Amino acid sequence: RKFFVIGNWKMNVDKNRINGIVKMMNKAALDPNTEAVVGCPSCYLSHAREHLSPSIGVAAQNCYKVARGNFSGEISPEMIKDCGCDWVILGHPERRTIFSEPDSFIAEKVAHAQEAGMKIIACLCETTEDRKEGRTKEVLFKQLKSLAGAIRDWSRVVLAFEALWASNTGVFATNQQVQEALALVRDWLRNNVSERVADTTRLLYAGSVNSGNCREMAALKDLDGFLVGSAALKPDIVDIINAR
Amino acid sequence: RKFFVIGNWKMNVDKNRINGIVKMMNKAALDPNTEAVVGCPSCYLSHAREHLSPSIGVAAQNCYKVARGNFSGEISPEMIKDCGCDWVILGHPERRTIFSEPDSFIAEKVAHAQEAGMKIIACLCETTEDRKEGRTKEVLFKQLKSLAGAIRDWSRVVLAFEALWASNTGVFATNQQVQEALALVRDWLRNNVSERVADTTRLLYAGSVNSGNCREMAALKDLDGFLVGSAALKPDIVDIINAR
Amino acid sequence: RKFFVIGNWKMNVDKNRINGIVKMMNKAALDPNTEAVVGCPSCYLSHAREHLSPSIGVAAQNCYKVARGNFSGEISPEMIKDCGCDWVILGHPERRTIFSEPDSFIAEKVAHAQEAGMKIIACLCETTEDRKEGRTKEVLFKQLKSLAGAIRDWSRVVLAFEALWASNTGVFATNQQVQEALALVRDWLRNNVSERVADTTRLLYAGSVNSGNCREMAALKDLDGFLVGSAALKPDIVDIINAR
Amino acid sequence: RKFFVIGNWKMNVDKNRINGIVKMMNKAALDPNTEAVVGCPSCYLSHAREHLSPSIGVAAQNCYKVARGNFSGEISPEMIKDCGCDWVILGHPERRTIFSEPDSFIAEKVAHAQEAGMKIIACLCETTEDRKEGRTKEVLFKQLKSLAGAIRDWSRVVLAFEALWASNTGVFATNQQVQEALALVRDWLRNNVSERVADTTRLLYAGSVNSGNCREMAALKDLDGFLVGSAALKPDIVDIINAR
Ligand SMILES: [Cl-]
Ligand SMILES: [Cl-]
Ligand SMILES: [Cl-]
Ligand SMILES: [Cl-]
Ligand SMILES: [Cl-]
Ligand SMILES: [Cl-]
Ligand SMILES: [Mg+2]
Numbered sequence: 001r002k003f004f005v006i007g008n009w010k011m012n013v014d015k016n017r018i019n020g021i022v023k024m025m026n027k028a029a030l031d032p033n034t035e036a037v038v039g040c041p042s043c044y045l046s047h048a049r050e051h052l053s054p055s056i057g058v059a060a061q062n063c064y065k066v067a068r069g070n071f072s073g074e075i076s077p078e079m080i081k082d083c084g085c086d087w088v089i090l091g092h093p094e095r096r097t098i099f100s101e102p103d104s105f106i107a108e109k110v111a112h113a114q115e116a117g118m119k120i121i122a123c124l125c126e127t128t129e130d131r132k133e134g135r136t137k138e139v140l141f142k143q144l145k146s147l148a149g150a151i152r153d154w155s156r157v158v159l160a161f162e163a164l165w166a167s168n169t170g171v172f173a174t175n176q177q178v179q180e181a182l183a184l185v186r187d188w189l190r191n192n193v194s195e196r197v198a199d200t201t202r203l204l205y206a207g208s209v210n211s212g213n214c215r216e217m218a219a220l221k222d223l224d225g226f227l228v229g230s231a232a233l234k235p236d237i238v239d240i241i242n243a244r
Numbered sequence: 245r246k247f248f249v250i251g252n253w254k255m256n257v258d259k260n261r262i263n264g265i266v267k268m269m270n271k272a273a274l275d276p277n278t279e280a281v282v283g284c285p286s287c288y289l290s291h292a293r294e295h296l297s298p299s300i301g302v303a304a305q306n307c308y309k310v311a312r313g314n315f316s317g318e319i320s321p322e323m324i325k326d327c328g329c330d331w332v333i334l335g336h337p338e339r340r341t342i343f344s345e346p347d348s349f350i351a352e353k354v355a356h357a358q359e360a361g362m363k364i365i366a367c368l369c370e371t372t373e374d375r376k377e378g379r380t381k382e383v384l385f386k387q388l389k390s391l392a393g394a395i396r397d398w399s400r401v402v403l404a405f406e407a408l409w410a411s412n413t414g415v416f417a418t419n420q421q422v423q424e425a426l427a428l429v430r431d432w433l434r435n436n437v438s439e440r441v442a443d444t445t446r447l448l449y450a451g452s453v454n455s456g457n458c459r460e461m462a463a464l465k466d467l468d469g470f471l472v473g474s475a476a477l478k479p480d481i482v483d484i485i486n487a488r
Numbered sequence: 489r490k491f492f493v494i495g496n497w498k499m500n501v502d503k504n505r506i507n508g509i510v511k512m513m514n515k516a517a518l519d520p521n522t523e524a525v526v527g528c529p530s531c532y533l534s535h536a537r538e539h540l541s542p543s544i545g546v547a548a549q550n551c552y553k554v555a556r557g558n559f560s561g562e563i564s565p566e567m568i569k570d571c572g573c574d575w576v577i578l579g580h581p582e583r584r585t586i587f588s589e590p591d592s593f594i595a596e597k598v599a600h601a602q603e604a605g606m607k608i609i610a611c612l613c614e615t616t617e618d619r620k621e622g623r624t625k626e627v628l629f630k631q632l633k634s635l636a637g638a639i640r641d642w643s644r645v646v647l648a649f650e651a652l653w654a655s656n657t658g659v660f661a662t663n664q665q666v667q668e669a670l671a672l673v674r675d676w677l678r679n680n681v682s683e684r685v686a687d688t689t690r691l692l693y694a695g696s697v698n699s700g701n702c703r704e705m706a707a708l709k710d711l712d713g714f715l716v717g718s719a720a721l722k723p724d725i726v727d728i729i730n731a732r
Numbered sequence: 733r734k735f736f737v738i739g740n741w742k743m744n745v746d747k748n749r750i751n752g753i754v755k756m757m758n759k760a761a762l763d764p765n766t767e768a769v770v771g772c773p774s775c776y777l778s779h780a781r782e783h784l785s786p787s788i789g790v791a792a793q794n795c796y797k798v799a800r801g802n803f804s805g806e807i808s809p810e811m812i813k814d815c816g817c818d819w820v821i822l823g824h825p826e827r828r829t830i831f832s833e834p835d836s837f838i839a840e841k842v843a844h845a846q847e848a849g850m851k852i853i854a855c856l857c858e859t860t861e862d863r864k865e866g867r868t869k870e871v872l873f874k875q876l877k878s879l880a881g882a883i884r885d886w887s888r889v890v891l892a893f894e895a896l897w898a899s900n901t902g903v904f905a906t907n908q909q910v911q912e913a914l915a916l917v918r919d920w921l922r923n924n925v926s927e928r929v930a931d932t933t934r935l936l937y938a939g940s941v942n943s944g945n946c947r948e949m950a951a952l953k954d955l956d957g958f959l960v961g962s963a964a965l966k967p968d969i970v971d972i973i974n975a976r
Contacts, residue, residue, distance in 0.1 A: 011320060075286060082287075092317065567746060580805065
């Protein structure tokens with residue numbers, strides 16, 4: 001499983017900031033054995049893709065569930081590809097919570113993105129309430145069951161897990177908690193899809209990884225890389241790419 | 245009130261289709277007394293702005309309610325301006341219905357778009373159900389009260405009204421019912437904001453307007469222009485801009 | 489209403505026969521006051537369009553209701569446009585009878601072809617059984633009601649009426665029966681859509697029309713042209729185009 | 733039995749997408765021991781055949797049951813051959829389900845395509861309601877008996893089996909389920925046609941095959957190749973052709 005790092009710029013960049021990040025990533029010595037991608041706002045996809053090293057992917061942060069139509073404010077996988085970009089993040093925790101996107105909606109998006117030839121970073125997450133009530137496994141099973149019902153080509157999927165109780169709360173997940181969550185996800189794939197898919201699907205930890213903790217975290221069992229928010233905007237992203 | 249036409253491309257264009265529309269609009273003999281704008285998918289804002297005559301505006305089809313932050317899949321007025329575009333459509337009926345955007349959410353967007361210096365096409369709509377339950381006044385007044393609370397500079401706002409019951413139900417809106425809906429909005433502004441605002445604010449009809457019915461609708465008493473979808477992709481958009 | 493003649497080649501041509509027909513139509517003296525179109529098999533659309541005079545349109549004989557997807561054997565309006573063609577025939581009596589296409593199916597096709605910017609020849613028909621049971625008004629009203637629910641841009645629609653009891657039966661419709669049916673359709677548009685649409689929409693007679701009866705039928709009050717089958721394969725199509 | 737791969741583009745391509753797929757397939761190092769075909773929309777048959785290496789066949793995705801006639805929207809094997817294409821897919825599960833094509837209709841098409849000298853990819857399928865109830869043998873034998881009655885020249889036929897219950901419920905058929913079904917089909921040929929026909933007829937699996945599982949599935953007993961949809965639009969089609 002090739003080490004995989006995606007830096008999600010969320011709604012935190014403009015053209016000037018992207019130019020600086022892209023120049024930094026273009027100039028740095030990057031581990032050739034890491035597959036690196038950046039998550040870019042829809043309005044900057046073409047700009048980012050034209051300037052960034054072609055070996056680094058560019059992902060839209062969301063898309064809709066059909067190729068065309070009367071859906072003001074939405075973009076399709078077909079339009080992302082038209083901007084030169086191969087990747088899309090689907091089911092991001094911010095869409096699931098702030099925008100209340102249901103699992104069935106995300107599944108419709110994943111299914112169409114797959115038909116369009118996209119590569120997908122599909123996100124899983126558990127809330128503070130989920131973890132306190134002991135529903136971690138229940139929520140992950142439900143989210144995975146929904147995703148797997150929409151996926152026909154697992155080779156073009158990467159999965160990311162975020163513990164929302166560890167995002168700007170004053171608490172981080174322990175190494176054991178991270179390893180146990182990703183081991184649960186891999187065992188789900190093994191038992192409900194196939195051993196081949198379990199053994200080849202990259203599982204990411206989405207959390208507060210940075211220069212100071214990435215090498216430690218990159219050695220965790222069942223971890224294949226990272227989905228990073230704030231470190232994507234900083235030199236830390238180079239160290240994370242280089243964590244192995 | 246300066247005649248105003250916005251052609252909304254929705255999710256129906258790619259870069260090649262935009263290139264054809266933009267060439268057509270750049271080359272067309274457009275009435276200098278019409279203010280013309282196109283509604284453009286977020287991923288093509290910069291492309292459209294860079295290729296479209298500067299005298300024609302470019303509108304994003306949606307935006308979020310703050311300038312920046314951890315909002316995957318959203319863009320801000322500040323980012324739209326960073327793409328060189330001055331306009332944003334807010335409260336479009338497709339967002340109100342398909343995406344269930346409540347008035348209070350649209351209000352937050354309109355307020356921050358006002359703060360950011362955007363020009364806004366703020367949309368009103370009456371559903372088929374609203375028409376049959378006889379609550380047209382009730383729903384339109386609630387929508388307007390919400391918008392007006394979020395607007396302190398009406399010079400940068402245009403209002404658009406869609407009768408959702410007038411598209412693909414078998415029932416067609418007469419010129420009389422269009423004029424009457426627009427006069428209702430205008431008098432609400434007279435009663436609840438100011439007569440100066442009512443006299444100066446452009447009120448648009450959003451509906452099935454094309455080369456065949458546009459000259460007749462452009463002469464309705466309280467109509468100041470059009471928000472059009474399908475015709476925006478056809479040569480009709482020039483005839484609509486030139487409807488007077 | 490500009491005189492309109494469409495020659496439908498149905499499934500009666502190969503490349504060689506198309507070359508013969510196209511050569512004949514290209515060289516013939518055609519009335520410039522007539523809008524001429526040919527109905528062409530899907531596999532020959534590009535060939536017909538690249539060889540036919542730019543003055544004469546090319547129409548596919550059918551299409552599906554979405555732009556793309558997992559629909560083996562179907563083509564979309566977007567693919568027809570990609571072949572350089574502007575027109576599609578929808579609801580042809582052969583598809584309503586042999587292929588049992590229901591009104592609601594044809595309505596989805598018309599609505600999507602409209603969204604895609606096609607020009608449409610939408611067909612109505614009464615069967616021998618309908619006429620025998622005195623249900624002529626009933627079936628035409630039902631078909632019209634369905635089509636009207638799907639049309640937003642009447643400027644891009646032509647309607648054609650076929651009396652199937654006049655097709656390879658040994659009975660022809662009289663000129664009086666044709667005028668009565670077309671006047672029925674035009675008054676339905678007056679009553680249920682608008683006077684302006686009734687005034688401007690071309691109504692065609694689909695039936696056995698050839699050199700010997702085209703001038704007489706072309707003088708019928710509510711007839712605006714012809715949807716021709718067998719004469720489209722013969723020099724007669726030139727006389728029909730020139731019937732006024 | 734020569735390994736056989738058909739990549740069905742369904743209704744998912746335009747001329748641009750074909751040109752990229754065709755250049756990729758043209759430039760690839762393809763196993764000369766694989767017979768490769770692509771399934772092409774009717775309106776692009778000539779375009780695909782004219783741009784594709786002669787080593788790769790081109791199949792229409794459907795046709796009608798006679799050579800010519802008053803059948804708007806239909807094409808014949810004779811017309812497909814006139815476009816230079818040798819193959820036709822008949823009985824595709826999308827035609828059997830979405831378009832409700834009955835076995836008797838499919839047999840009329842197969843018999844006429846045989847008369848016309850076509851090569852045929854004839855499809856079988858088991859729906860969700862079929863795997864449940866357990867009618868695997870009975871409905872498949874109905875489809876097979878119908879195809880066999882319409883075939884006098886098996887050298888020009890390939891059979892494809894789709895477990896529609898898999899794709900439609902979002903799961904994958906096991907390798908034992910695939911081998912069981914193809915062994916079932918071949919044993920039916922052995923007992924009801926001839927040993928020589930069972931021994932020489934290529935049986936394909938129609939399902940979600942991609943670069944990750946194609947080598948595994950290509951080694952399955954009684955499997956002679958693949959009918960693939962989504963992977964035909966991706967570089968995976970090269971890996972599938974080369975899976976042996
Ligand atoms: Cl990319
Ligand atoms: Cl993130
Ligand atoms: Cl602008
Ligand atoms: Cl609109
Ligand atoms: Cl044309
Ligand atoms: Cl009347
Ligand atoms: Mg008053």
